[PDB]
Design an enzyme around this catalytic site. Sequence first.
Site, PDB file in Angstrom:
ATOM      1  N   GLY C  33       0.769  -1.217   0.000  1.00  0.00           N
ATOM      2  CA  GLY C  33       0.000   0.000   0.000  1.00  0.00           C
ATOM      3  C   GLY C  33       0.801   1.268   0.000  1.00  0.00           C
ATOM      4  N   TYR C 165      -2.214 -11.819 -17.923  1.00  0.00           N
ATOM      5  CA  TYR C 165      -1.429 -12.985 -18.350  1.00  0.00           C
ATOM      6  C   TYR C 165      -1.459 -14.137 -17.351  1.00  0.00           C
ATOM      7  CZ  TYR C 165       2.525 -10.816 -15.787  1.00  0.00           C
ATOM      8  OH  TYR C 165       3.329 -10.276 -14.803  1.00  0.00           O
TER       9      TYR C 165
END
EC number: 1.3.1.124
Lengths: 279, 281, 278, 279
Positions: C33, C165
Site C-alpha cells: 500500500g 497474463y
Amino acid sequence: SKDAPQSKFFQPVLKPMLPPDAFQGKVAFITGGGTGLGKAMTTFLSTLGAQCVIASRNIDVLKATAEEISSKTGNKVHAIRCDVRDPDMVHNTVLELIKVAGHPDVVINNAAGNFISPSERLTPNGWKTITDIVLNGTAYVTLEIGKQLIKAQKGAAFLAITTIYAESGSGFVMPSSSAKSGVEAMNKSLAAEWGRYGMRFNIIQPGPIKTFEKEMIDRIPCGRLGTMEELANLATFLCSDYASWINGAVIRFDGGEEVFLSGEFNSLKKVTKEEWDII
Amino acid sequence: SKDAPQSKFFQPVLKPMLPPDAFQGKVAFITGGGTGLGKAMTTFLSTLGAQCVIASRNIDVLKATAEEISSKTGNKVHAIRCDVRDPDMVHNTVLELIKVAGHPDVVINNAAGNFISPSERLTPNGWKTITDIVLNGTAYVTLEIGKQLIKAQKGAAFLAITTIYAESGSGFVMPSSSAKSGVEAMNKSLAAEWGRYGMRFNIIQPGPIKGRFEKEMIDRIPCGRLGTMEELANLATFLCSDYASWINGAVIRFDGGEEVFLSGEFNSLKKVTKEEWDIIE
Amino acid sequence: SKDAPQSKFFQPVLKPMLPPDAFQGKVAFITGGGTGLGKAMTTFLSTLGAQCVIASRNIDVLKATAEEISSKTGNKVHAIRCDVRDPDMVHNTVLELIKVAGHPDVVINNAAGNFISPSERLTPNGWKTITDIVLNGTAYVTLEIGKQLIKAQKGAAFLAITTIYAESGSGFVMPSSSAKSGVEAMNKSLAAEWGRYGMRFNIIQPGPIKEKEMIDRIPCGRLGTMEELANLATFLCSDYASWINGAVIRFDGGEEVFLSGEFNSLKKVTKEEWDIIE
Amino acid sequence: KDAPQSKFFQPVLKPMLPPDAFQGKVAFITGGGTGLGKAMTTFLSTLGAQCVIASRNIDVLKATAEEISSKTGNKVHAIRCDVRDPDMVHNTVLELIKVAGHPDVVINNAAGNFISPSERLTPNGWKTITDIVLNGTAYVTLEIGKQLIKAQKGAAFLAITTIYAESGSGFVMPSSSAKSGVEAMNKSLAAEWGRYGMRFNIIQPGPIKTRFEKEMIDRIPCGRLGTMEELANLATFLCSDYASWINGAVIRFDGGEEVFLSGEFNSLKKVTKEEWDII
C-alpha cells in the site's frame, strides 16, 4: 425469508452509487428497457441524468414504463416499438433514436427470450425463436448503431447482459446458452475490432436475481438472490466514463454461484465440523 | 516450405494412428464430409472400418468423394444431399441415414460458412447466412439425431469442429466467432444433459490448417507451420472412438500453440535478441 | 504523446466516483500500500472515509505514504513493516492490524515482484522469489486474516490484483504468470468455500498502467491510470458490490481481447485494401 | 456400482497406438512409480519407449521399474528425486541424460494433496503443496528445457493437473492454486519455447478409479469413474509424434463432470417425465 445466515454479511445496497449528474448530457438506448432488468437499468440511468430510449415489442408496456420513470426523475424517456428479430425494424428504430434523442453514448442489449425444457423436447421453431431474438437481435442492434456511430465519428459504451451459463453451457436452457454465448463472442470481437471507432463493449453474466429459489440459495455463497438495483449499479458503472478503460471485460454478477457450482469439491460444504474433527 | 525453422522439431505424421478396423461395425455421419476437413475425417473413419454417410448441399461433390474413399478402403460411403439450414431436410436426411446405414455411432458437425470482413460492412443477410449454417444447422442435426437415438435407446459420440476464435472472439470473423461459440455452448450443454442417454459431445478448436495472412500466421505459430488435415483426422477419430469413451464435454485446441502465443501479453518479446537480453539484465 | 488517435474517445476520469462516505467506519488492509497501485487504492479508500493499514517491507516508504494520505484526508493510515514471504511476520502483522485499527472489512493483496526474462535464464532463486512473494505471500495473508474473521464471525471483501497474463500464460513473465494464476485459483476457491463465513473474493486483471508498441495493441489507445484502477477496486470492495463474489474483471483497455483474437491483426488493412478485397 | 448409462461408455483398457509408436524414444515421468504415473510409464514402455521414473521412494520406483521392464522387455530406470529440491532435480536430469538420453517425452505428475477446510491449513501445509506441485514441476521443466536448448533437441511435455485448477475449488485450495500455476507455466512455455522445439500440454482429470465416490458418480454424465488406462491412452497420444501440432492445449478427462458441475440448470436432471409433461 429464505436467505441463508451468511446473507447478513452481504446486505444489498439499493440506492444509485454514482454521482447524481454522472450521465448528464448523455443518451442511452436499452433493449428490453420496459421490464425487469432493462427497466431497472433505465431507471438508474434516468435518475443520474441520462436521456433514455427504450425499445421492445410491447408499446403499451414501454410507454407505461417510460412515463413512470420520467415522472420520477424529470428526465425524458422515449419509447420505440421494435422487434429485434426484424433487421429492417431495427434500422428504422436506430434512425428514430437519433432523431428523437441523438446518437447514443450508452447501448444496453438486454432483450431476450427463454424457456426451460429438456433439449429433446425442443422443436426447430423453438430453437430458432431464441437464437433469432437473443443472438441475431443483439447483432442487428449492435451493428446498426455501430454503423451510425462510425458515420458520425462518435463513440459509445456498449453492454450486453448474458448469463453465467453462456460460458459454461447448461442443460435445459440449451438454446439460451448457445445464443448468449454467441453474444459474448460478438462483444469480445467488437471490443477488439472497433476501438479505433471509439466503441467499447462489456458483458455482465448474472446469476439468479430476485423478481425453486430455495434450492438456488443453497448454491449461492452469498446466501441470497441478487437484486435488480445492484445489477443496475454495476451496469451504470460499466457504461459510465469512470469505466472508459474497461473494454472486453466479462463480469460475473452471481453471489459466487458459478465458482461454487464449478468447483469439484465444493459440495463438501456439507461436512460438519464434528466430521472434519474425526478426520 | 514457408515454414519457420523450428518446424523441423514438429513434423507431421500423416498416417492413421488407431488400430486397423478400430471402427469396424460402426456408422459415422459427417456434415461437410465431401470436402476439406470433413473429407479427411471421413477418409480416416472409412480406412479404419467405419461405414460412413456424408451430407452437404452438392450431391456431385459428395458422390465423387464417396466413390473416391470407398474405392480405396473397400468400405461403403453413402452420400445424402442436405442443406443443414433447412430443418425439414435435416429430418429427412437423418431418416435416410438410418435407412441406408443404421443409427450413427459417430456424428461430426463440420458444415460451415465464413468470410473475412470488417464488421461494419456486414449486412443482415451475411450475418444470417453464417449463423444459420453454423449454429442453427448444427443444432438441427444434433437435435434430430439425438431424438432418434433416444427413441432407439442407443448412444453415440458427437464431435463439433469450431475454432480457437470462438472462445476468444475475433474482429473480422465476428459472425463465425459468434455462431461457433454458440456451437461450443450447445455441446457443453448436451454433454451435461444427455449423459443419461448415452451421448457424449466434444469440441475441437482448430487454428489454421493447410495469400499473405498464411505467412504472417506462421510467424505467430509456435510449431512453425500450419496444421494438416491428416493430423486433425487423427485427433477427431480418437475423440470419436471407444478409446475416448470417458472424454465428454471437452474442448481441445488443435493450433500449433497459436492461441497461447496470441493471448500472452509479453510473447512479442520473442524478437528480442540475445545481446539485447544481456543489456536488459 | 504516445497515445493513439482513438484515445480521444476514452478519456480517463481521475476523481473518486463513490459517495464521500462510502467507507465511513470501515477498516482496510492493503499489502504493497505504500507505492504504485496499492498507494492509489489506499488513497481512494482513505478519501472515502476508510481507516487504512498498509504493509510492505520498507517502513520509511510506508510511513511517508501514510503521512501523505492521512494529511490530505483526515483519516488514519497505519504503516506496518511486513515481508509477506514470512508467515510469522504475517501473523504478527495481522495481530497488529486488529489491535491498532480492528478486524478489516476490506483486504487487498497487491504486494508483488516481477522481472522480464527468457525462461531459460531463470534460476531457482529467481523462481522462488516471485512465487514466494506473490503466491505464498497472498496465501499467508488471506489464510491468517480469514482464520481471524472466522473466529470473530465477521465478514470482509477481499480483492487480489493479478494480471491478464495469469489466465493466458505469457512467455518472459512465466514465474509471475504462474504465481498470479495460483492467486486466481485461490480466490475462486475461497469465494466458494468461505462465503458461508461472510467473506467474498474478487480479482482484477490489469493490463498496462502508467510503450508505444503496447499502445498499438490496446483498443482504447492509451495506458490505464491508477485512479481508474482505484475506482474499480473501491467499487469491488464497497457494499455496493456485496453480491459480487468470485468475479474476475479485466481492466486492460481491451488489450486481452485484442491479443487473443486470431484475425485482430487485420486492423492494419486499409479501407482501400478492403474495397479491393471485395 | 456405476450409474445406468455407464453401459454406453464402457472403458477400453488396451493401448491404442501402434506397437512401436515410441521405439527409440526416451520418456521421463515424475511420480512414475505409482498410480497414474505408473500407468503412463507402463503404456510408454509397452509401445517401445525407454523410460526413466523419479520420485522420493527408491524402493517403490525399483519395484515398479522391474515389474514394467519384465513385462515389456524395455528398460525402465529409477532415479530417486524429491522435486522440491532444485539441486536434486538438476542432478536427476543429468543422470537421466547419462543413463538413457535426452527425453523426447516429459510428464510432470508428482503431486501431493489432502482435503481440508482451508481454515485448518497451516502455513507449512500450504508451502508443502505449492513446493511439490508448482515449484517441483517448474524445476523439472526448466532444468530439462535448459539441457534441451543446449543440445538443440525438442520434446513434448505433459502436465497432469485437474479440472479444479481452472475453476478453483474449496477444500482442495492449495492444490487448486499450485495446479493452476502449473497450467499457466505450461501455456507460457508453449508460447515462449516453440523456437526450441518444445511443446507443452495439460490434461485436467476428473475422478479416476483408485464415500464421496458414489456421490461423484451421480455428477458424472458418463456414469462412472475414469480409468488409469484410458488416461494413459490420452497421455501417450499427446506425447506422441501424431500430436506434434498439439501445443498449449488443455484437455478435460472427466466423463463430462466439469460441464455438469458448472452449468446452472443441470440439476434439473432430477425432474421427471411427468413433471415436464405437466409444464
